[PDB]
């Protein structure tokens, strides 16, 4: 129900306090989907990395309100999930034990990759760095393909 129709319900109490900040993410998403034309391929990936970052940050905002500091009502938080201001499944992954700093949900899907393993942003930094120091070259992973995630491990 992201569009507001007759079937929608009116908002609970605290939403008008947090309406402006969410509004920022809305207008910033309407810069990201706006078709800036780029010739390159990496520079056309930068746009999708920006969109996935904005979606992640809006979901972190609603998560850090309801779960960490308990600042909004449960009756409002169910409305924000219903009206798709938040990703229910990504927050469900944030509530787990090994996953808290998780970028997106394509970096833990085992079926998508060539051989089993998740995306390389899920690795801790120090383990990659000790393997790269053992082979002696350097650690060559700057930024992920799916999200643009730069080390979204729980310790990092």
């Amino acid at each position: 129900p992201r569009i507001k129709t007759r079937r929608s319900k009116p908002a609970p109490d605290g939403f008008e306090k947090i309406k402006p900040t969410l509004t920022d993410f809305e207008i910033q998403l309407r810069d990201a989907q706006k078709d800036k034309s780029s010739k390159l391929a990496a520079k056309s990936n930068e746009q999708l990395w920006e969109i996935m970052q904005l979606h992640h940050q809006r979901s972190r905002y609603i998560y850090t309100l309801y779960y960490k500091r308990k600042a909004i009502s449960k009756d409002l938080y169910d409305w924000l999930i219903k009206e798709k201001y938040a990703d229910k499944l990504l927050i469900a992954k944030w509530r787990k034990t090994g996953y808290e700093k998780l970028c997106c949900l394509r970096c833990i899907q085992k079926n998508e990759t060539n051989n089993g393993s998740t995306c390389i942003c899920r690795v801790p930094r120090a383990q990659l760095e000790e393997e790269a120091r053992k082979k002696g070259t350097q650690v060559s992973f700057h930024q992920c393909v799916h999200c643009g995630c730069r080390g979204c491990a729980s310790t990092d």
Partner: peptide
């Protein structure tokens, strides 16, 4: 083989609060 204080010490050197912050230097 790292300590829990040293992980936070390296992590505060990292730019850009979320995961999208670099380990690079600029």
């Amino acid at each position: 083989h790292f300590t829990k204080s040293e992980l936070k010490r390296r992590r505060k050197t990292r730019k850009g609060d979320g995961p999208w912050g670099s380990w690079s230097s600029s």
